[PDB]
Amino acid sequence: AQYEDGKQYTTLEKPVAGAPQVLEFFSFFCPHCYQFEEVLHISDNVKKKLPEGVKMTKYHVNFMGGDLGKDLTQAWAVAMALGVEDKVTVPLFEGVQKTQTIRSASDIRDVFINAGIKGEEYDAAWNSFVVKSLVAQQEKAAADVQLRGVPAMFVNGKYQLNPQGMDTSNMDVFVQQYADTVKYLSEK
């Protein structure tokens, strides 16, 4: 077959009922994730190839970066709660991996302040139980598949993208194959 279980994707041994249609996991510490976001724009190109109004979900993980990694999962919860993902994703990646100016929870907060989120609003969200529940949701979703590597994408709780089996000579062709694979999986 043109798409084969074991090649462009794998099938979850223990499938996850009731999971988001398209679910991505990343870490701001993760070098491929940096590329997926700023260089390849994987999430954007998958959304364009899926039906309008499809639920795409993107969650941060704790297992890279120790204390700061957990702070970033909580900061990503704040980003989701306020709806400012599109404003902080690039500066968070660059602060962790490019300039390495993010060394503390305060430095993460600075990124939100610079992006125009008011300090009182960031702090209220950071301390909110709505954000605690978003953190729990991110952890539970990752736990549902004993996740140990990012970046990772899951389709309907059943299939995991396998980018290792895609040609990487041409960035655009790679992105297109990845997105076309997500579309194929979503239609299974």
Ligand SMILES: c1cc(-c2ccc(CNC3CCCCC3)cc2)cs1
């Ligand atoms: C979990 C996902 C990966 C992975 C494997 C391969 C790629 C593709 N690298 C891109 C391919 C296009 C050229 C630029 C770099 C991206 C991520 C390694 S572990």
